[PDB]
Design a protein around this ligand. Structure first.
Ligand SMILES: [Mg+2]
Ligand SMILES: [Mg+2]
Lengths: 226, 143, 151, 213, 34, 41, 51, 255, 267
RNA sequence: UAAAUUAUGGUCAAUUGUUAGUAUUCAUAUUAAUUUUUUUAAAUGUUUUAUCAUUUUAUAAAGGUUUAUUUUUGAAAGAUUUUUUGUAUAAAAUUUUAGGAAUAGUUAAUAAUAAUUUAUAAUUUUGAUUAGAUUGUUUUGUUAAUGCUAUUAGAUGGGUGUGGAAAAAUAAAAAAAA
């Protein structure tokens, strides 16, 4: 009897008349986090875990749920969830493939609004028709490779500019001038001459050994005296 | 009109400007190319390439040197193998023996669900650290 | 991160050490990048290279830099910093001026050629620091004169 | 039985018919490569992965899947057992027996099957390597086997492969072709694992098509 | 708001929630938020 | 720390008394770091 | 009170199967062929000797 | 160990065999990839299917797009022939002469007994249907195979003027095979695929030149670009090129 | 760099601390960078580096630092030979999923390096302990490659020198013998171990069956040095030192939603 | 850019803590739960047969997984009989950490190829990969309520691979061929 009070509970074996017999899982448990690492010495290098981290895939707060009511489902009568996807082909470097960026939708009930999340897929195509920029429609099919389970069904928009550039021999799209950063620290352009290459190398190695010395910790207020 | 950055371009947002500007799909496709072979049959489910091959059309983009070389190398495979097996059966038979014994001496000769898993490290992650050592990353592709 | 350190936590072994790239022979793809904590585009312009002007390739700096000043003021900065100028440095300055000569029109490059000859006069009157006016520099100057048509 | 004869009669009358402008290529579609399920299943040339409720016009088959049955002496733990293997080749409609032999020896892809010269035979009757399938009337349902050079004396123990269970294998014999693949030395990992069946799997007698009890 | 989640002060929990806000979600206009 | 801790709609950037407690901490930190820098130099 | 009096009287006036609307359930062509073949086989025979 | 334990390319199940005989009775062993090689890779192009009655008698006449000898495709295929002859000298009889190149739009068999009245109707229909179409431009690139590799032709990708060309050829088929009875190899409601034949094995040459053209001869040029050619004439011709050293002229329309 | 960190005594002390409480990568990188920029490295520095290298049991780094010492013309003591032979003996090796842990050992040829290190340590006049010889024999016989003749010669040398035999090298040599099909040598090793009294082979004694004739992937195991699972060993014995076969697991030493302390349990 | 009605219909939304100049949800209430007054074991021989054997008996806690766990009718149900018809390993979305950077027997094409083929490969700042935490998308608690706060048991590698299916090494509230 969940609706009955604590003192009103004469027994707990069955529900006498009807309702919902639910286990009273104790939410108020006062879970404790035990600090097992130094403040600046957490084993992970990117994300630090300093408190109780909430666990769950869909039960987390704020609530996030899939939204099947999007453009793809409005256009297509999908036999299976996510069977058909419309997206732009971005990246054509693997033979008989076409990488397509299609965006799904996730809904937040708490804020009562939706946002779009972009996901990339590998779409198989024959005769190499998919050129960069085409608005394509892809559908699920049999597994083709380790990461290929979509295939293009129709090229809604042909990239005329890309095809003409390919005919002229140039790339379908100029490569972007900005990419992923290789390292967090900034990359400084090297312009030293041949004579100064060794000096620049010495300076760089000195900087690296200083960064290694930083592992030691704070320098003592009193210099070491024996 | 060079793409701003690779991080944004990979997610297909460079071409999303055409979608956002209202010019997403406006090209007069019939004039630039035949639209009969650029779609797919819903009843059969065959793709645009299948429709093109059924109608005798070929919508092939201009190709660079490397893809043409790949296509030629893959095409020459059967012609090379047919003559090689006849002319020099010694090495072919040795390789066949090695493969025949390799199929016996391997991992999961039975085609169960574990072996059939296309992405073994991604599917079985809980044993990737303590049980197996062959893979170091739990995922290798977009999925 | 596998090469240095096991998991991290030890200070000085989380972030990769400083990486230097030769733009003429790049060892990375897309050297410039955009990130909240990895903005390196601003660190590839003129002004950061004054610290190491004593040992650098002026030709490479001309080839790849941002907000590069005029060649006359660049030479003035070099002289004021008293960095010795070898033959290839002088040739690089002259070809940097010639790549503006070419940009200017055929009939409108007389003023720029006069600027170039004034720069050459300053170079030959530089005295200290030692400026090496060499055969390559003379060839670059003759090429600029040919471009200007002042036979 | 009935299907083959009725298909032949229908094809004959279709050929004899003269008032036919020809099938529409656009209206008649081909088989698709993409479909549900993670298996690539090939069907007959007249079957499609999609539902096709209309019976299409019959066509002359330009590619017959000839299936040749080879003897194979697989190594079971109890002993050597002789069983059957099928090698399938795609030969044109008028392929001579010479090119059929070329196709079978190029598509056998087994180390033991094509060890020596062999002749193709049907129901025990040898096939002349000069005429084509048209003379023999060979269809896709024809049962064709092959007879090797030394399969007429395989009943002899000397011709039979020698198992280590009953026969002694020498230091020169372990260096031979099949006995190198087989491993008489039990390795820790036991790399050559083979099919095993008990000696009493078939009872006191071996496998037979009749009853002996 | 459970006290063990995120930091001791509640503004830690609120800042942690703000990274999942739909209006501030990572996109072309708002990228590299952290 | 939070120098501008003034109440809601405070017509001034901060409080003079509150600012001194932050200036003292800043001065002490700077002085100790400068002295240690001089010693290690 | 979950009693019948709480439910609307209009629940009792409806005809049989009028509550269900029209559904448009489409499937892959391969699934359509599989289902058609299975239904044809079941129509031809559904059990060994109990059909 | 190199990759997946069971590659996707090797998970092939054959439905041509009986269901219960593959598990126990026998094991089928074959290379199933060859028959599933796609038409794009193997160069096969689906030609219009001819009925059995029309597939027996040999053709008599054919429509073609007459082109000047100076056209770009002629010298492109000339250089292709030079490369082929330099690489292998045995494919010269298979290779056709550069002066016998035309873009075929349809093939038919006019009986010789009643050819005179049919050719006039055919030529007048061609004139009346081409009195309005402007000269066409076609971009040729790629290689294809007909008659199981017997005929090697240059593919015609869709491009500008190709839609007009296919509409015109459909109208020609309607006006020639539809209203008046002439044996078209295909169907009047079907559209013939234009092509120019670069290599072909004659039935008499089938005795010693093999059964098909090996793919290695044209593998490198399977996707070669032969460029854009403008056509402004049409000709109904007959298979007679040897006597005059040129295409036989039976009907012509200056489009 | 400030003079306090520029002082080479600070370099030595920080390098020693790094070797005491870090991985091999830290010490190797720091020492290499310091040698590159100033910081004249001495025999003490080289021995400190070799300490961590041997602790982590790596061969390529050890041969690199040995080549560096040869270039710098520093005369080493017996500690260097002990460290290099122990590193060779502690080099990782394992057949997991038909895939060896280290494919570089075959190219490195660490057995020859261990043998020459032992020979040089004996020749130059330094003490030779049992551990160096046992490590050398371990390098000689492993599941990777078969080197039994040289191992037998080394075992005869140990027998005539009255040196102790370690159970790890005894087990490795026995496995190598049974894999190379030398039951006579396996029986001799079993007799020697039984006579000595090794913990593993105290009871295992067998009679001599070769009494009338005179003389003339496979293994699936993983071996790594102690330092890899020293933390696991320490916490296992701290938690349950009265039930050794307990399989120390989660929640035995840390409550829910709290770190267990050791990063990378069971690798 | 018109009003309503042939009149409450179609079935209950409702907030309670005696403070302490003002700013800001933060001491003490109520409900739910833990805590004292001693409530509260998980059983030891499964069975039949043609006898040194064979036949029937398939997911308990062990190992820490956030782009992740997915498959059969070949046994059985199962029937005059023979015979026959079909599958299925694949997906899509939701995925944690105060101070956030690189990851890897690796992507695609080819094939029952390649420890040694071909290619301008693939993952990731739209937050990846390692590391920490936690058995994933019908379970509670509180409130008038978009919230906040909980939940469980079980899929942790192969290596003669039996079986329809490995889930196969103590652990019942499963009657298992009279
Ligand atoms: Mg607490
Ligand atoms: Mg984990």
């Amino acid at each position: 009897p969940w609706w009955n009070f604590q003192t009103e509970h004469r027994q707990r074996c069955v529900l006498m008349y009807g309702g919902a017999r639910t286990k009273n899982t104790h939410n108020a448990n006062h879970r404790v986090f035990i600090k097992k690492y130094k403040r600046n010495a957490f084993p992970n290098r990117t994300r630090h875990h300093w408190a109780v981290s909430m666990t769950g895939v869909l039960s987390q707060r704020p609530r996030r749920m899939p939204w099947p009511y999007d453009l793809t489902s409005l256009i297509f009568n999908q036999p299976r969830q996510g069977s058909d996807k419309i997206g732009y082909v971005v990246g054509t470097s693997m033979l008989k493939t076409a990488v397509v960026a299609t965006n799904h939708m996730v809904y937040y009930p708490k804020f009562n609004q939706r946002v779009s999340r972009t996901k990339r897929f590998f779409a198989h195509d024959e005769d190499l028709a998919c050129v960069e920029g085409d608005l394509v429609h892809i559908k699920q099919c049999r597994k083709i490779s380790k990461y290929k389970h979509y295939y293009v069904f129709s090229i809604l928009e042909p990239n005329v500019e890309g095809r003409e550039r390919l005919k002229l021999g140039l790339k379908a799209v100029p490569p972007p001038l900005f990419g992923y950063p290789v390292s967090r620290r900034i990359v400084k352009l090297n312009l030293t001459s041949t004579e100064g290459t060794q000096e620049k190398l010495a300076a760089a190695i000195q900087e690296h050994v200083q960064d290694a010395y930083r592992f030691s910790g704070p320098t003592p207020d009193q210099p070491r005296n024996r | 009109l060079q793409p701003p950055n690779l991080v944004t371009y990979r997610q297909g947002s460079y071409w999303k400007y055409d979608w956002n500007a209202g010019l997403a799909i406006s090209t007069n496709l019939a004039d630039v190319m035949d639209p009969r072979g650029l779609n797919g049959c819903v009843e059969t489910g065959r793709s645009r390439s299948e429709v093109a091959r059924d109608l005798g059309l070929s919508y092939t983009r201009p190709l660079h040197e490397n893809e043409k070389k790949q296509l030629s190398h893959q095409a020459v495979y059967y012609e090379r193998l047919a003559k090689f097996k006849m002319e020099q059966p010694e090495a072919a038979r040795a390789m066949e023996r090695e493969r025949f014994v390799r199929k016996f001496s391997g991992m999961f000769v039975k085609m169960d669900i574990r072996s059939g898993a296309p992405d073994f490290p991604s599917t079985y992650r809980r044993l990737l650290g303590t049980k197996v050592v062959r893979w170091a990353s739990k995922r290798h592709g977009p999925n | 991160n596998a090469a240095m350190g096991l998991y991290g936590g030890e200070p000085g072994f989380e972030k990769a050490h400083r990486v230097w790239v030769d733009p003429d022979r790049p060892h990375i793809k897309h050297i410039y990048n955009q990130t909240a904590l990895a903005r390196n585009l601003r660190y590839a312009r003129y002004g950061y290279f004054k610290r190491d002007m004593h040992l650098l390739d002026v030709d490479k700096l001309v080839r790849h830099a941002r907000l590069l000043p005029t060649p006359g003021r660049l030479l003035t900065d070099f002289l004021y910093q008293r960095v010795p100028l070898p033959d290839k440095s002088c040739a690089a300055l002259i070809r940097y001026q010639r790549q503006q000569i070419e940009m200017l029109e055929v009939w409108g490059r007389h003023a720029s050629f006069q600027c170039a000859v004034e720069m050459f006069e300053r170079m030959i009157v530089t005295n200290i620091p030692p400026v090496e006016v060499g055969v390559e520099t003379h060839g670059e100057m003759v090429l600029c004169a040919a471009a200007c048509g002042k036979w | 039985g009935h299907y083959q004869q009725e298909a032949f009669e229908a094809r004959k009358r279709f050929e004899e018919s003269t008032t036919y402008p020809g099938p529409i290529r656009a209206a008649t579609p081909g088989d698709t490569r993409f479909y549900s399920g993670s298996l690539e299943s090939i069907l007959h040339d007249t079957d499609r992965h999609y539902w096709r409720a209309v019976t299409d016009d019959p066509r002359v088959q330009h590619l017959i899947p000839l299936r040749i049955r080879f003897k194979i002496f697989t190594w079971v733990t109890s002993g050597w057992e002789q069983r059957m293997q099928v090698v399938q080749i795609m030969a044109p409609k008028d392929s001579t027996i010479a090119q059929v032999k070329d196709l079978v020896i190029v598509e056998n892809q087994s180390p033991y099957l094509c060890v020596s010269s062999f002749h193709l035979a049907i129901d025990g009757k040898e096939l002349d390597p000069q005429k084509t399938l048209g003379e023999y009337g060979i269809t896709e349902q024809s049962q064709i086997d092959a007879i090797e050079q030394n399969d007429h004396l395989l009943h002899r123990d000397d011709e039979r492969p020698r198992d280590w269970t009953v026969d002694e294998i020498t230091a020169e014999d372990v260096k031979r072709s099949p006995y190198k693949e087989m491993e008489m030395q039990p390795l820790q990992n036991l790399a050559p694992r083979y099919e095993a069946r008990p000696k009493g799997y078939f009872g006191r007698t071996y496998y037979s098509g009749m009853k002996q009890s | 708001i459970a006290h063990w989640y995120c930091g001791h002060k509640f503004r830690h929990r609120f800042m942690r929630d703000k990274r999942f806000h739909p209006s501030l979600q990572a996109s072309h206009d708002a990228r590299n938020r952290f | 720390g939070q120098v501008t801790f003034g109440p809601r709609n405070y017509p001034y950037p901060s409080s003079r008394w509150l600012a001194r407690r932050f200036q003292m901490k800043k001065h002490r930190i700077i002085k100790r770091f400068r002295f240690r820098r001089y010693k290690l130099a | 009170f979950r009693g019948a009096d709480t439910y609307s009287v209009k629940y009792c006036e409806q005809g049989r199967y009028e509550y269900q609307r029209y559904l448009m359930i489409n499937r892959f062509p391969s699934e359509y062929k599989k289902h058609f073949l299975s239904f044809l086989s079941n129509i031809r025979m559904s059990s060994g000797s109990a059909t | 160990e190199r990759g997946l334990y069971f590659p996707i390319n090797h998970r092939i199940v054959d439905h041509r065999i009986a269901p219960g005989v593959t598990v126990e009775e026998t094991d089928v062993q074959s290379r199933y990839r060859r028959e599933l090689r796609t038409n794009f890779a193997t160069g096969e192009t689906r030609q219009t299917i001819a009925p059995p009655w029309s597939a027996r008698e040999r053709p008599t006449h054919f429509f073609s797009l007459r082109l000047p000898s100076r056209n770009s495709v002629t010298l492109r295929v000339k250089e292709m022939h030079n490369h082929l002859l330099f690489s292998h000298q045995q494919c010269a009889p298979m290779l056709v002469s550069p002066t016998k190149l035309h873009i075929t739009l349809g093939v038919m068999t006019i009986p010789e007994n009643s050819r005179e009245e049919l050719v006039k109707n055919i030529q007048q229909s061609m004139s009346e249907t081409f009195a309005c179409v402007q000269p066409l431009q076609l971009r040729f690139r790629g290689l294809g195979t007909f008659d199981f590799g017997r005929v090697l032709f240059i593919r015609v990708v869709p491009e500008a003027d190709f839609g007009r060309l296919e509409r015109a050829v459909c109208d020609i088929r309607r006006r020639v095979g539809g209203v008046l009875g002439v044996d078209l190899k295909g169907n009047p409601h079907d559209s013939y695929v234009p092509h120019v034949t670069v290599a072909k094995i004659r039935p008499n040459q089938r005795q010693q030149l093999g059964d098909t053209i090996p793919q290695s001869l044209w593998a490198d040029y399977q996707h070669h670009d032969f460029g854009d050619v403008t056509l402004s004439t049409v000709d109904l011709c007959r298979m007679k090129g040897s006597p005059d050293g040129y295409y036989h002229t039976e009907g012509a329309v200056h489009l | 760099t400030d003079p306090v960190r520029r002082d080479p005594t600070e370099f030595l002390r920080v390098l020693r601390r790094m070797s005491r409480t870090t991985s091999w990568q830290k010490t190797m990188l720091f020492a290499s960078k310091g040698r590159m920029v100033g910081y004249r490295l001495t025999r003490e520095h080289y021995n400190t580096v070799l300490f961590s290298q041997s602790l982590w049991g790596r061969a390529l780094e050890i041969v690199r630092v040995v080549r560096a010492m040869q270039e710098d013309k520093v005369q080493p003591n017996g500690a260097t030979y002990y460290y290099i032979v122990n590193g060779m003996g502690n080099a990782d090796h394992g057949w997991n999923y038909d895939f060896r842990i280290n494919r570089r050992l075959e190219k490195i040829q660490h057995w020859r390096v261990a043998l020459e290190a032992l020979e040089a340590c004996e020749a130059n006049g330094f003490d030779s302990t049992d551990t160096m010889h046992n490590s050398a024999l371990i390098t000689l016989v492993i599941p990777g490659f078969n080197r039994w003749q040289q191992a037998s010669l080394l075992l005869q040398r140990m027998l005539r020198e009255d040196r102790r035999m370690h159970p790890t090298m005894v087990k490795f040599y026995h496995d190598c013998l049974v894999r190379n099909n030398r039951p006579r040598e396996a029986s001799s090793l079993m007799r020697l171990a039984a006579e000595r009294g090794v913990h593993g082979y105290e009871d295992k004694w067998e009679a001599d069956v070769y009494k009338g004739r005179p003389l003339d992937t496979e293994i699936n195991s993983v071996f790594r040095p102690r330092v890899y699972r020293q933390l696991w060993y320490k916490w296992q014995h701290i938690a349950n030192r009265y039930r050794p076969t307990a399989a120390l697991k989660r929640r035995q030493l840390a409550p829910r939603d709290s770190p267990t302390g050791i990063p990378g349990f069971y690798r």
